[PDB]
Structure formats: structure tokens, C-alpha cells
Design a binder for this molecule. Structure first.
Ligand SMILES: CCn1c(-c2cc(N3CCN(C)CC3)cnc2[C@H](C)OC)c2c3cc(ccc31)-c1csc(n1)C[C@H](NC(=O)[C@H]1C[C@@H]1C)C(=O)N1CCC[C@H](N1)C(=O)OCC(C)(C)C2
Ligand SMILES: Nc1nc2c(ncn2[C@@H]2O[C@H](COP(=O)(O)OP(=O)(O)NP(=O)(O)O)[C@@H](O)[C@H]2O)c(=O)[nH]1
Ligand SMILES: [Mg+2]
Lengths: 168, 164
């Protein structure tokens, strides 16, 4: 069968983790806010000529339950680390997610992609260069996205699969 | 005298039974009044017809989105949202009735009924009532829930109002 990739979407509340995933899976944009408990999705795609099965875990951004992320970080193969380009605190929260992932997996080498979402909005507070420099210091790709316009949605998830492939 | 309201619960349209609640108007009058008025429907809108969209066994039954019926909506009698009145009362165990929210001062109409003690919600959700009669109905609602809250049948408030 085709190879399966366990992707995990993480980041602060409201950055657009679910909107991005639902855009990937269902090709439409959720305008209302449905806060996530935990959701899982499956989708087959072709990436670099090779067909594969995405297993996506869409996680809650609730800070209250930060202790309970360790188990899905153990299971996950790659992590989409999402912030919103109009929310500087969500950008600052990224360091804590990457540190938590590295600690849980006890490795400096975990497949990750930095995603700056909501690039359709005019209220930008995190500059592209700011995020690009952070991603470079981590050694991971950076992708700007909009769940509303679909800009970069496929690119973010596919780039993460390529990161897992380079690791495996 | 604290008011009492009732929900008549149905499961895929078939009757299940009645749950009644005491509303702590003596401690959280504004929050209790919102729930009371939405249970009578006296403002032209309210809980009748709405569903319990999120049921997680071991924790709680959540409902009250009568505006969008998908767990994202709801509104108070004071406007779309209103402030946290106080956090005097705690999530002490099964039967506690408390306001859902999306952060500070975002109470609308969504609410949850505890089926266990949920003390980490203390000081974040406004407790304003408790089940008086029919806790076994809430217990019976749990098996239609799931780990992430998705329900396997449609659990609805077939009728609701204030008891004398
Ligand atoms: C980590 C996984 N997780 C978990 C969780 C937590 C634990 N423990 C924590 C405590 N320790 C001591 C023991 C272990 C164990 N197992 C799980 C679940 C079963 O693992 C899948 C929860 C949760 C809540 C949210 C997101 C992820 C979450 C969440 C997402 S939005 C939210 N909360 C608050 C929610 N706002 C809304 O709906 C807004 C839309 C309306 C207006 C809200 O007002 N209410 C009412 C109060 C209850 C809350 N909903 C809710 O549903 O709580 C679920 C619960 C299971 C109680 C907690
Ligand atoms: N304009 C715009 N709005 C977006 C975008 N992505 C998400 N949103 C909006 O932002 C809000 C929160 O989105 P959501 O996907 O629920 O965020 P989340 O990260 O999954 N939140 P949670 O951690 O609670 O599960 C919603 O109103 C959604 O429509 C985007 O790219 N552009
Ligand atoms: Mg979400």
C-alpha cells in the first residue's frame, strides 16, 4: 500500500489549525470559530510523483491542557507549527511548541514546518523576514498560508511530508 | 427563592426524560436570569429545539447553541455575550451547571452539565446552577457521546420552561 504519514497540527488557539486542515480535506473555508477538542482526518495525495496517505491530527490550542500534548507528540511523525501573522503572541508561542516537541521526542531532528497563517489579512504584525529568520535558525521550512484564499495550503502539508521523507 | 427550570430531553426525536435545575439567583443573579429567560423562550428565542452538541463521557454534556446549531453560536438576553459575573461557586462534582465560553467575559447561551468533578475549570467558567431532578437522564445522555464529544444520536431539548 501507499506510505502513511502521521502529521500533527499544533499552535496557539485561533491561529487557523482547523481552517487549514478542513481546507486541505474538504476544500472550503470555515468562517465561524469551532474550538477543537481533537480531530483526525485521512486524505490521499500525490507528492513529487509518489502517492501517499496523510493521517492528520488536528489538535487544540488550549494552554490549559499543555501537559497532555506529550502523547500525540510521541506518536506524530511531523509537526505543522502554525502561528497567525496578525498575532505576535502566537508567533512567540512557537518556541514553546518546538521545545516541547524536541523534549518529548528527545531529538534535535524532528520533521517540522513553520506556517504563518492568515496572510490574507491586512493587520500583519509578524514580518515575513522575522518568521523566515526564525525558521532558518531551526533548520526547517517556512510557508505563508491563508485558509481563506487557500494560498499555500497544499504547499504547507506537502512540504511537511518532504521533511519526513528526508528524515526517513 | 432560586428559580427552577426544566429540560425535556429527546434522542433522535424519541423522549428520554426530564432534567430540572436549580438556578443560583442568590449568588449569580444575572447569569441565572439569562438561563431562566432562555429556558422559557420569553424573549422570542431560547433553548427549545436546540441540541447537546458535545458529550464527553466522564466529564460533561454541553449544549445551548440555538443560533447556529453547530457549537459555535448562541447569544445571551443581554447581547451576543456578557461578562463573567463571579467565580464564587466551584465545579464540585456531577450535576453542576456552568457557562461555556471562549475566554474571559464571553458568556452567551452555551452551557455544560458536569458528570464528574472538573476543578480545573474553577475561576474560568461561571457556575450558576445544579441538577435538582433527573440526574439519571444526564447519566443516560453520556453513552451517546465520545472521546472528542461527537454524538452518535441527536440529543435535543424537546421542550423547556420554568417550574412553579
Ligand atoms: C486535551 C484534550 N482536552 C480535554 C481533556 C482533558 C483531560 N484532562 C484534563 C484534566 N486533568 C486533571 C485530567 C485529564 C482528559 N481528557 C480530555 C479529552 C477527553 O481528551 C480528548 C478537555 C479539553 C477541552 C478543550 C480542548 C481539548 C481538551 C476545549 C476546547 S474549547 C474549550 N475547551 C472550552 C469550551 N468552549 C467552547 O465550546 C466555546 C464555543 C463555546 C462558546 C467550553 O466552554 N466548554 C465547557 C467546559 C468544558 C469544555 N467545553 C470541554 O469540552 O472540555 C472537555 C474536557 C474533556 C472536560 C477537557
Ligand atoms: N481571514 C482568515 N481567517 C482565518 C484564517 N484561518 C482561520 N481563520 C479564522 O480564525 C478563526 C479561528 O480559526 P480556527 O481554524 O478555528 O483556529 P484553531 O487554530 O483551529 N483554533 P483551536 O486551537 O481553538 O482549535 C476562525 O474564525 C477562522 O475562520 C485565515 O487564513 N484567514
Ligand atoms: Mg481548531
Amino acid at each position: 500500500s501507499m506510505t502513511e504519514y502521521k502529521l500533527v497540527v499544533v499552535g496557539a488557539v485561533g491561529v487557523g489549525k482547523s481552517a487549514l486542515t478542513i481546507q486541505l480535506i474538504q476544500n472550503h473555508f470555515v468562517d465561524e470559530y469551532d474550538p477543537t477538542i481533537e480531530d483526525s482526518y485521512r486524505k490521499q495525495v500525490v507528492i513529487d510523483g509518489e502517492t501517499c496517505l496523510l493521517d492528520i491530527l488536528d489538535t487544540a490550542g488550549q494552554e490549559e491542557y499543555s501537559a497532555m500534548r506529550d502523547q500525540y507528540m510521541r506518536t506524530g511523525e511531523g509537526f505543522l507549527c502554525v502561528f497567525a501573522i496578525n498575532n505576535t503572541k502566537s508567533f512567540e508561542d512557537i518556541h514553546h511548541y518546538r521545545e516541547q516537541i524536541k523534549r518529548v521526542k528527545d531529538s534535535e531532528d524532528v520533521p517540522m514546518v513553520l506556517v504563518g497563517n492568515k496572510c490574507d489579512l491586512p493587520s500583519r504584525t509578524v514580518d515575513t523576514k522575522q518568521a523566515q529568520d526564525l525558521a532558518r535558525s531551526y533548520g526547517i521550512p517556512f510557508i505563508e498560508t491563508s485558509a481563506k484564499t487557500r494560498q499555500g495550503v497544499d504547499d504547507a502539508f506537502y512540504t511537511l511530508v518532504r521533511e519526513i521523507r528526508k528524515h526517513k | 427563592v432560586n428559580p427552577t427550570v426544566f429540560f425535556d430531553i429527546a434522542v433522535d426525536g424519541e423522549p428520554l426524560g426530564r432534567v430540572s435545575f436549580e438556578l443560583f439567583a442568590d449568588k449569580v443573579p444575572k447569569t441565572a436570569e439569562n438561563f431562566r429567560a432562555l429556558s422559557t423562550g420569553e424573549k422570542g428565542f431560547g433553548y427549545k429545539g436546540s441540541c447537546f452538541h458535545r458529550i464527553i463521557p466522564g466529564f460533561m454534556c454541553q449544549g445551548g447553541d440555538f443560533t447556529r446549531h453547530n457549537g459555535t453560536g448562541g447569544k445571551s438576553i443581554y447581547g451576543e455575550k456578557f461578562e463573567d459575573e463571579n467565580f464564587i461557586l466551584k465545579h464540585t462534582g456531577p450535576g453542576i451547571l456552568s457557562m461555556a465560553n471562549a475566554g474571559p467575559n464571553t458568556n452567551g447561551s452555551q452551557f455544560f452539565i458536569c458528570t464528574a468533578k472538573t476543578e480545573w475549570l474553577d475561576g474560568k467558567h461561571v457556575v450558576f446552577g445544579k441538577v435538582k431532578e433527573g440526574m439519571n437522564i444526564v447519566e443516560a445522555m453520556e453513552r451517546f457521546g465520545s472521546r472528542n464529544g461527537k454524538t452518535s444520536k441527536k440529543i435535543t431539548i424537546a421542550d423547556c420552561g420554568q417550574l412553579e
